[PDB]
Every structure is written in C-alpha cells, then in structure tokens.
Design a protein around this nucleic acid. Sequence first.
RNA 1: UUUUUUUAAAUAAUUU
RNA 2: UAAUAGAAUAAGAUAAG
Lengths: 70, 391, 452, 123, 314, 297
Amino acid sequence: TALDVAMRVNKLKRLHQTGGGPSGKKQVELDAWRDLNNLTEAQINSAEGKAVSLLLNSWAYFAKYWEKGA
Amino acid sequence: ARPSALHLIFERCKLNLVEFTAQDVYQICTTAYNMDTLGMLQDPDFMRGLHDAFRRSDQTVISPFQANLIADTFRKVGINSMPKEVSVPEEDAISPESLILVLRNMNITKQRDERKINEVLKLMFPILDEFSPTQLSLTVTELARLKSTNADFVGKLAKRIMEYNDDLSALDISSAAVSLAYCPGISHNILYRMMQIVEERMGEFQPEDYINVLHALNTLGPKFVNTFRKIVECGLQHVENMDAVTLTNYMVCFSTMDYKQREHIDIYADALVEVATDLSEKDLVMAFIALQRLRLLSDTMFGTMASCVIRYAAKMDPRNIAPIMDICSTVPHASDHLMKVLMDRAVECTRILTANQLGDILDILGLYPPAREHPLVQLFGKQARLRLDLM
Amino acid sequence: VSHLSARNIATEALQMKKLHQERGGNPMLAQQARRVLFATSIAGQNLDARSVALLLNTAVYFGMESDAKLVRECIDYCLKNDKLITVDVLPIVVTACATLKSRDAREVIEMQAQKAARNAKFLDAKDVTNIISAFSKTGINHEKLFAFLSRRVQTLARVGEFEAAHLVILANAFSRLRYRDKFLFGAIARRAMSLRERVTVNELVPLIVAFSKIGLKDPKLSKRFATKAMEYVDQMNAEQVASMFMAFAYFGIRYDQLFGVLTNRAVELIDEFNAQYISTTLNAFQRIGINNPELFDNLAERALAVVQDHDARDISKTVTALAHFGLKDEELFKRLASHAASIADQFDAMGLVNTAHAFARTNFLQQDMAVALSERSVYVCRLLDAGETRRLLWALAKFQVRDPKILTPVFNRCLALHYDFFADPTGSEEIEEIFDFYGPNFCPPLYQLYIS
Amino acid sequence: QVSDGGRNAMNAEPTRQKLRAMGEQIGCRLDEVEYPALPVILSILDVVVTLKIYVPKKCLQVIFSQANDMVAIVMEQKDDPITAEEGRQLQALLSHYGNDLAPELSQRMKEAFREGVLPDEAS
Amino acid sequence: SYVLKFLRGQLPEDLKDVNGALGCLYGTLPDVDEFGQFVISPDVVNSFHQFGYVKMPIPVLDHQQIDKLADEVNELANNVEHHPKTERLYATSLADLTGGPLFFCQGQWRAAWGMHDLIYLPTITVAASQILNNSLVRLWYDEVFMKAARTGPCVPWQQNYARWQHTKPVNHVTVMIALDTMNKDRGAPCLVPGSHRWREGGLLPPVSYDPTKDEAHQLNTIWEIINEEEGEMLMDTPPVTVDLRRGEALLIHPLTLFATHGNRSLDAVRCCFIHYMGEKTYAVQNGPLLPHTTKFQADAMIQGPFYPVVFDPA
Amino acid sequence: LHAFVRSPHYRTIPSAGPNGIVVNRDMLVHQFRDFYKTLQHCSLVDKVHLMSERPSVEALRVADQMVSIGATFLEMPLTGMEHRATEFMESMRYVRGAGGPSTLASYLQDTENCRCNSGDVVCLPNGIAVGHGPRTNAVAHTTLKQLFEVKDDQFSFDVFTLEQEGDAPPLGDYFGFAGSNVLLTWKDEHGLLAVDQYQQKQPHTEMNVVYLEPGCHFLSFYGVDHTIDVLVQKGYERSMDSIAAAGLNPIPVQWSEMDKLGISMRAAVLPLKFFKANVGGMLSRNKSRGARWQTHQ
RNA sequence: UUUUUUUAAAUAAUUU
RNA sequence: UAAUAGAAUAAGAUAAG
C-alpha cells in the first residue's frame, strides 16, 4: 500500500531531523527523493487520509533542504 | 512546480476523493503554517477542498483549540469557516470532564449559547460533588469568561473551592479571586471570605498573582480598600524592582479606591516613571489618566510621560486621542508638540471616528487657541454635518 | 474597506441607511451599501449585541431577504444570545425581523415581545416609543403587551415627558396596530395641547392623520383639530393639503368653513399636485361625499398631464372617484385605461377588481384594458371576498369574456363563498345580470344555488 | 377602586368596611386549604396585611406551619426556588404577626439568611 | 405611491423588475466604450464553430465570488427553511417538498442576488455576442444543477434545442459554469465533438431514460439513436470529457450532443447553465414559452421583462 | 447620580391628610410634575427614573427603603413597613434596570431589635451623623459604629450620635450640608440643638451655618461631586435670600400638597450613585466640570 | 384629564 | 503545545374589520 512508504519516509525524515545518519544527510535526502517518486497511480488512488498527510508533511519538510524546489 | 506524485496527491485532495479525519486535517494545516515550500495556502482550490473535508469530518476527536486553529488558518487564506457546535452530553455521557469540554469549546471557538450554558448548569448541579479541585476552578473561569448571569451557581462553586484552601496554590487562588470579581451578581459575603483568603498567603504571591489581585480589586471597587491596603504595604518592599504593568495596575487601583496615604502613592508613582518607557499604548494611556486623577502631574512628571506618549502618538488608536487631549488641558504645562501631532493624527482618522469620539475631540479642542488655524475645524465640521443623524 | 472592522461596518451602514431614507433616496448609496453588505460575515470575531443588531437592520433595510448569509448569522446570534439583546437594541432587532417571515424570525419576534411585556414598567421616554413603533412594523396580536406599553405611555405622559416627534411616532404606531384606547389617545392629544407651539405644521398633520385613522368617533377633538389647523393652511404644502383632505374625510364630520379654505389652497397649488395627491383628494371627496365640480375640473385637468406618473393604486382610486361622481372625461379615461393595460401586473387584489368595476360601470369598454385585466384576474381570485368576487364577475361579464381559463377561478371562488355570495342584497341586481349573460349552461351548480 | 374625593366620597368608607368584612369571611376559612408553593402564601398574607383584614390565630398557625416544611425542604435537600426577597418578606410577616405563632420557622429562616441558601432575584 | 420609511430601501418582489444589474459581485457594468476588454480571440470562435463547444481560456469569477454563488445554490435547496421567492422560479426539484439525489432549479435569476448579477457578466456575455454573429444577447433562462455525494445520478445524452422546439430559429448558445471542481467522477461534461452538424443541423430522436440503472449503460445509450455514419464518426472521434476548475466556463452549441457524469466524490457538485439567444428569434405558436410568462402570437419577436437584453454592440 | 421618584396614584389620594388638613389632588399632581421637571433641570443628576403608580399614598416615600453610606447601600429593617415590603421589591428591580447594585446590604435586617429609619443619617464630610431619637434605637447606633466607624490618621470615618427629643422630625428633614462648607438647618429648637451638638462633637473646625425658617423643606445633593443647587419651598422667601447670600443657588419648588400630606422633598427622591465595573486595569472616562486651557486664556 | 392594572387558571367536544 | 477584553447613541402615513 501507500501507508508503509509514507511511514518509512517519515522515519528517514526523523533521522535527518535528529542527526545526519552514518550515510550522511545528503544521501538521506536523495533516498527520500527516490522513495517519494516511487509512488504510482495505484497507491495514490487508494491512499487514506493519514498516508496523504504523512506524504505531504515529508515532502514539505524535504523541499526545504533540496536545492531544487520540487 | 508540482511533480507527478505531488500533482496527483494535490488533485486527489482537491476533488474530495480522500476521506480526511480531523487529525489529518490538523496535521496538514500545521505543516502549511510551519513550512510554505509546497505553496499550500497559495492554492485556493486545494484549501477549499481541505475545508470541505473539514466540515464533513468528526471534529469531536480533536481538542477545541485544534478546531479553532483550523478555522483560523482557513479564515486567514480567505475561507469563511466555523467549527461545529458540540452537543450537550446525554444519558451516560454526563461526566464532569465532558460538561467542562462544552464550556471550553464555547469559549475557544467563540460560539456562545445561553441555552446550552443553562442546560449544562442544570446537568452539573446534581453531580457537583464529583468535581476535582482543579475542575471547579476551570468551571469558574469558563463561566466568568462567558459572562454568565447564574451568580448562584458560581457562588456555590466558590464556596466549594474555598473549602479546599489548603490544596489550592497561589495562582489558583488569584485566578479564582479575579474570576469571582468579574461575575456581577456574586453575594458580597463570598467576596469578603475570598478576599480574606487572599489576605493570607500574601508573601507567596508572584507578579502574575499581584496583577490578578489588582485586577480583582479594581473590578470590586472601594468597599475592599482594606484588602488593597494589605496589597500596598506588601508591595512596599519590592517596589524598587517591579514590573511596569504591575505599577500601572497599582496606579489604577490607587485612582479607583481614592487612596488617602499620599506617601505610598508618591513612592509608587516615582518608581513607575523610572520604567514608564517600557509600557504599551493602552498601559501608558491608563497610567497617564491615573496620574492626572491623583493630582501628581508635576513638570518633570508630565514632561517624562509626554516624551513617552509622543512615540505612540504617530499611530495612536482613535480611542486614545481624546484622553491624552483631556490630560493636556487642565494642567499648567507646555504641551505644544504633543498637541500638534495629536491633532494631526485626529485629522488623519476623521472618517472612522464615531459620533461620541468626534464630539469629545471637538469639545476639548473648542477653547484651544492653536486649533482654530487648522484644517481640522473645517474637516470636522463637514464630518459632524454628516454624522448629525447618529449623534 | 478591507481595513475597516465590522464595528465600523455597522456604523457606516447605519449612516448610509439614515442618509438613504431621509436625505433623498439616492441609488448610488443604495448600491454601494448593498455591495459592502454582500461581503460581510459575523464569524470568528467578538461583536457587541448593538453591532450585530445594526448589521442585521441595515442589511434587511437594503432588500436583503432571509436567505442571506449575514441575515442568517445575525438571526442565529440573537437566538443563542437572547439576554444580550437589552431594551436598547430590542427595537432594532424587531424592526429587522418585521419583514422577515420565517420560523426563526417568528420565534425571535415572540421572544422579544415577551421580553418587552415583562419590562414594560421600567422603560423611559425613548424606549416606549421605539419599542411600540418596532412592534407596529411587525404584525402581532399581543394585546397584553400593547396594554402594558399604553399604561407606561400614559404614566410618562402625565409628567409631560414627550416631544412632538415622540407624540407623532406613538400615535402612528398605536393607530397602525388598530389599538383603540380612548384614554391613551386623549392623553396624547392633551400632551399636544400642553406642548402648544412646539408642534409645527410638519408635526401636526401626521398627528391628525393618525387620530383620524384609528376612528375614536369623538367629535370633541375633531373640531379642535380643525380649529388648530385652520390657521396653518397658508403654510401647508400640497402633500399636507391632500393628507388633510384624507384625514377629515376619515373623520366624517362636515366642516364647511375648513373645507372651503382647503379647496382654495388646493386650487392655489394645482401646479404642484402629483398623481398621488390628486387620487388622495378625489378619494377623500368620494368618502366624505361632497360634490364640488369646480375643484374636480382642475383636478382632472391636472391628472391629464401626469398620466405617465400614475401608479396602479392611483389609477384605481382616480377612476373609481371619477366614476362615482358621474364625471365624463373621455380623453382622461382613455389614457388611464391604456396606462392600466400597460402596468396590469402591478395591480393588487383590491386594485384590480376596483379598476375593472369602475371601468365597467361607466359605458367605457377598451379591449387593451379589458384583455389585460381579465388575464391578470386569474392570479388574484384566491385573495378576494364574496362581494369582491361578485363585483369582479359582473365587470368581467360586462367585458364579454368567455375564456374558460379565466372564468374557472372566479366561479370556483364564488362557489366556495356561495352563502356570502347570495346573501348581499345590494348586489342582487348584479346577480340577475351575471346569469343573464352566461346563462344556466355556464357552471350549473352556481345556477342551481341561485335558483334556491 | 374607591376614591376618597370622588362623587361619592362620603360613601367610600362604608364600602371599604363591607369589603373588609367580606374579606374576613374568607379569611376565617384559611386553615382547610393546602398551599402548594410559597408565592400563594406570600400573596394571601400580603392581601390580609395590606387591607388590615383580621385573621384568627388558628388559621395563621396552620399557614405558618405549612411554609416551615417547604423552607426546610429547600434548606436540607439543596439538590431539588425561594429567593432571598421572598424569605425576607416571610420573615417580616412572621415578625409582624408575632413569633410565638411558629417559633421553629423564625430560627430556621434566620439561619437560612446566615448560611445563604436562598438565591437572589438577579440570578 | 408612498413607500413606508422602513421599506424605502427594499427591492422588488421578483428580481425581474430590477432594470439593469445590481452591484454585488463585480460592482457596476463598465461604460459603453469599455466593453472591448472582454473580447475573445478569433481562434476561440473558430474552435467553437469547429468542435461545437469551447472552453474559455480564463476563469470568469474570483474564488470569493464562486463561494458566494455556491452559497446561493446551497440556500436554494434548503428543504427545511424553504427559499424566499421560491414561487419566482419556472421549475424546482423541491415542488414535491422532498427533493432527491439531484437538485435542479430554473429561473433562479429572479430569486437570488449574484445569480441575477451572473446574467449580466461581461466576460461571458461579450463572448456570447461574438458567438451569435455580434447581435443583441437576450437571456433565455437559467438552470442550476446540484448532485449529492456518492449518490448523484447522471443526465444522459441530450440536445438542448430538443427542449426549445417552440422557438423558430436556431439562434442560441449555452454557457455552463462550474461552481465546484469537476472530473469524470463528479459531474464533468461529456460532449461529442462535431455533433452539431450531423443531421443537416437537425435533431436526433430522444433517448430512452430508464432510471435506477448503472451509469455505464446510461452513457452507452448513444449507440441507439445514431445511424451507421454517425457510428463511424463516433468511432473516429469518441466522446470526450472536459475537466472544469472552480470557475471555468464552457460555451456549448444547442445542437451538440451533451451529457453530464454522475457524482462519486465525497461532496456535492454544483453547476450553472445560462442560455442566451440573439435578436432575430421568433416563436411558432400562440401562448407563453415558459410558465407564467408574457404570451406572444404567431411569429412574434421574443422580448419582454422575462428575457432581458444583457448586451448591445451598438 | 440617578434620582428615583414615583408618580402619585390619583384615585387613592387621601381627601385629608394628617391633622385633618384638606388637600387637593390636582394641585398635588401638578406640583409633582413641576418637581420632576425641576429634578431633570438639575445639572448634577445623570438620570431621573419614574416608577409606576401604586395604590397606597405611602408608596411615594421612596427614600425609606435604604441609605447610602459611602460605597455601601444599607437596607433599612423591615419592621414597621411590612405592608410596603412588596413595594420595596418593585423599587429594587428599577435599581437593577438602571445598572445599579444587584442587592442591598442586609446588615441592619439581621440584627435583633435594630430599629433604624433612613433619614436620621446625614452625610457630613468624612463621616455620618445619626439621630438617637424614637426612630433609631441604641442597637442600630452600635451596629453602625461597629460597621462604618474607623479611627486612623487618613482612613478616618466618624459616626456621630445626635440626641433629639420625641417630637423631633427626622434629622435629614432639618439638618444637612450644602456646597462644600455650608450647613443648612432650621431656626427651631431641634435645629439649634443639633447644630450645637455637632459643634461640640467636632471641635476646632471652621464652617458656615445657614438658618432657614422652620418648616421650609430643602433638598441638597451633598457628595463627591460639588454642586450649588439647593431646592427650597416656594413660600419661604427669607430662606431663599439666606441661601443666596451664602453663595449657593436656591431653586424654589412648589411643595404645598406633599407638605400637607407630611412628605418632604428629601423623602420623595432616591438619589443613588452608580458606577461601571472596570474589567482589568482599565479606567473609565468622566465628564468634565471645570474650565479648560486656563493658562492660555 | 382622572379611567382602569398583580392567577399555576386546562371542565367545551368529536368522527374532521 | 497553544485564550486577554475598552466605546453607551430617538424618523414619522398600507383603500378595516
């Protein structure tokens, strides 16, 4: 589904918020980009409110650090 | 720019195809208020869909202020929104917490309803014995804010609260005192006993406790002057290091009670004018009126306070122009520069002044020599001819 | 206007309303105020009861119905917070809710009526007149409240606590409610006596009109009003002369020495009379019954010049008055018939039947007028009396109208009121005319009821 | 409805005496009834005092005994609307007629004022 | 007459008598020499004449105006405190006092503010004049549709002029304005491109409406009224659904085949249809064209208070 | 300052009052109307309230209900006025309507055998004078001293007991203060005795004493707000001359019928000082009463 | 210019 | 996770039972 992807992206978001992680914060941002772009039309057309809110929160937070807007 | 996934998420939100709960709407609104990278508030068709989801959701799960915050963030973007009124609990739902929640929602969301207040009071009468000491004070505060006329129930709550004097702290005592003072119909015996309680534990008071007690004494009137006496002496050892707003409240209380001991009044005024530069517009105006009403505006006093009021005179509130104009008169001191900027400010806001304020300003400026050679006389003449119907 | 708070919006709306109703009805102000009020909401802001009442009153004053958002928000506020509507803002809410005819409006009006009934002993000079006027706007039958307000008015008037404006407002409000109290109106008349010179011409004519409308059948005060107004005729305006004629036609007592002076003054100001004044004077002369051809010729000649200014009410009253006196003015009747055919949809229930009967009584038939009013007659059948239905049916028969889509409503209405239809002796002749044209074939049940 | 300076001003006092006597007729039979609420008692006693109607001591004792149970219910139960002004009027009435009629009601009502059970008219 | 002092500011009983337009939504109408700003590009007119419909490039109303206009619709279907001036409507879905999953109203321009203002909107009226060969634009009538959530039905294929047979010449245009965001799952229009020139500008036979059936069959009833060649051009260019925003408008030819999708969203969907006609429009019979309206005779030019002139290019 | 008065009941006005003196009801009504107008024309009073008529002629004595001692509204014991009890209720609602106190203090009512009559209390500067006559017992004196008497350097309030004979009228009817210094009293036995007693109990104090003719009813609003309006009866010219020569403004009032009914001007009015509760540290605007911009011109 | 005010009231009758 | 207050003010004709 889509809730698990949002939850793991939120875990990455919390890891970036607290520290940078062993692999670095830039790698965390890149992995967040790949995970966020993974969503397809099947998941988003059946996502619940909580998953959509979590995805929006993670995307809004990660748009601050990304050099491009996105 | 919205990528494909973000664009599709935004479209699903816009089309009301996603079932949002109150918690999810609150999270989205908090994210929008915190970070504006996605431009959520810049999309009217997205915020309108979020509001539509908000209306058709169960808002009882979230706290009253969370619904108020959602309504506020919808109003700021331009959407007319209002949280739903909570229903009175029925059958097994009557518990002290659920009944306090109704008053709290009525307070925070500004949906005051006399009928539901009466129903809640009638439901809370039989189970008043189950209230914890904190819930009694919460009820007293909530009923005080809602301007309830049921002074009998508030008196019962005050008696029950005062039965628990040992449990309560200084902040709770001060809050109960001010809330009781705000209620109009409280029997004076309860007020006397509460003020007796406040008289003890006098040294435990903090600056906020002092402010609350001074507000209560100001509301009560001169009949409690004795209690105010125990305030002034208690404040005599801490006056040299005291907050400016506390000193303003002290001066207001001195003016209200018509205090007779001039030494304490002089001490408090001399300590106030040292830190008078830290006051806001309203506090400075009230302090300026209080100093005039106590016959304490000497040359240095008036000069120092006018130098402070000139700063706010540029963008003064319409409600504050007339008072300082009154203080400027009836004193034998030079106030040409203050009156010039005050008259200019009155000229600027001539189209928003009410009939009473315009009449007052004209009355003070009637006998002022430098006011005749001003555009204000003609502008106010036209405005008064317009406003004669509302006078 | 975005920087203005709702407390300022209410004040400016009140200012606009005061300028609109008294200092000329400028459509510029009306549309500006409507545009300003169409984008206002009492939501998320703490407001006084007075501000909400002013917003509601100024919104309703400008044509805003009960389906509006601001009107609904103001009505909701009043219901939830009722005790906040003190006696100072009670008249504002009642006046706002007067024209609003809905469940919430009815409930609010009843609650404020009970509040005013309870607190009738504690009002002062301003509050009693404001409350009684506001309740005179709305149609209510709470006699007890009116009696309490009258007792308070008498108590306040004993110590002399009413000005001329207060007196005229009180008299108009109490005469509008059809509340016949001999002592209340005697106290008002004696207060006018005591005020003496403080009652000017502009403030004396409406008092006489209000005293005439209530119909106290007291000849002791009608003579006094005639004597007091006989000195003010030279100052009276044309609109005041017409109202004087109407009021002393309402009284029913003949004062030749006053009517002569009024006639001379009306002749002097013949160039200033509008259609409304001509219709009012003609109706007053019809009611009082004097037949004065000399003034009637001038009035008809003036009305021939303001034909395009005539309203449906004015057309009905003028035509009825001219038909009653047997005055023949072919050009005026032709022009009035064409005008009535032009504005046939503005006729109310009484006006349509009165105009049709007045045109049919005289030997004046015009297809332009006849077809228009016959077609319009369908929408007013359900609002007619048995005698009015008989008059309308006779007028329709004089027009030789046979369309079933027109005749079925009127025959249904006269069948539903058949007892009162056949119990009026003065219309008996008309009956034997109506069935002489239609015959037994048209609506057999009515014919059988006529036979019995 | 009687005027002391009207057309029949000389006749006014006999009418007052007749009214008073026919009020005595009712007042003598005031022990059989059962008062449901205090306002009935406070109206009957107000009429009796205002018109100077004489009432036998027995009826007064019954009337004041009935109100005692009601005020006792209001004070003791405290859970269940006798306002302070009504209680003051009742105290004044009892003091006027004499406290020997109902010695329990006097102490009960005086303690009700001291405690503050009776609410105010404003509330 | 004498308008009482507290009734001087009121409005007529029905807003038909209001000559001109009130200033509520966009203030007052511009001056005679200020009507050239709302002109549309000639390519838009060519696209309308080619496809049978066209979507105007810019939204016609601001979001606050759309919110107010949607509030008017919400209060036009109260069913508890029924709308004032309800009798001032040609037809209503609540005449039975129960309503249903679909709410339709007609002649609402005589009942509520804003809706009366929307008729005189320059942005749509200038475009309608350009569509009608630069002639006088007269209101034909209004229509408001509101489909409930999860249960709103769909209006099957229809031709507008099939309901206007009592008007002699084909000289009409439809402007449909979305008061809410629409999609194929909530009330989007579904029009057949090039369907206004099929039967030599004629009318197709009416479709068979069987309610209480799935939306797919209702939209698939098209294959029963067309012939073989119309089947071929339907094969070549299948029906296309137009997505509309919160204020976007759409011009439609009277003879273009047109349907509306159902509502499967979580909220009600609203839309407003306004029909305009040119100067040279006549009637065919003797009698009124709408309930309780002015009656014409033979080939009488259609004019009156019920069909106001909203634009004049002279 | 709000002044409360009640209209007379014309139907039940007695044909003859105390001592058998005949009275005329029409002139009584006319004089009451003139009194109401005179009260309204006074600049000091903020509002004049007119309660509805009541059947008894005794209901006109409105001041009998309570007294204003400083900031305390003390309600008189309901001992001799049981038949007026409900009337008092109808008067309190009026006070509640004008924004006044919710209820009066019941300090005097609770005390036993505490007979007090409002009108024996005179509001002298920095204290009150009470009369130890028939209308007031020693218990009321003791309670008033226990309640309002305070001895301090600056927070000083004095309660003076002025003894009077049995035939003396209420102290307020012949003893009062006017302006800020003037003393108004009758040149009668009781007035001179009261003045001598007040001099004895308050020595080393300079003040002016003005002697009016006996039976000349007066009414002067003495209080925080200074005024020079002294209402007086029309018949007594020399009292008016004395008050004018004392530096005050006499206002002659026709008071024949009310005097012949035994009611005075003081007992016919209820003057109460109302304020508005100030929420928080907020001061309320006050109307001006002096000259502005004296230094300029 | 001198008319009058202050309950908790609950007992009709019907095929609509 | 979220709580601070100020203003005192009156327009006036419905073809009746």
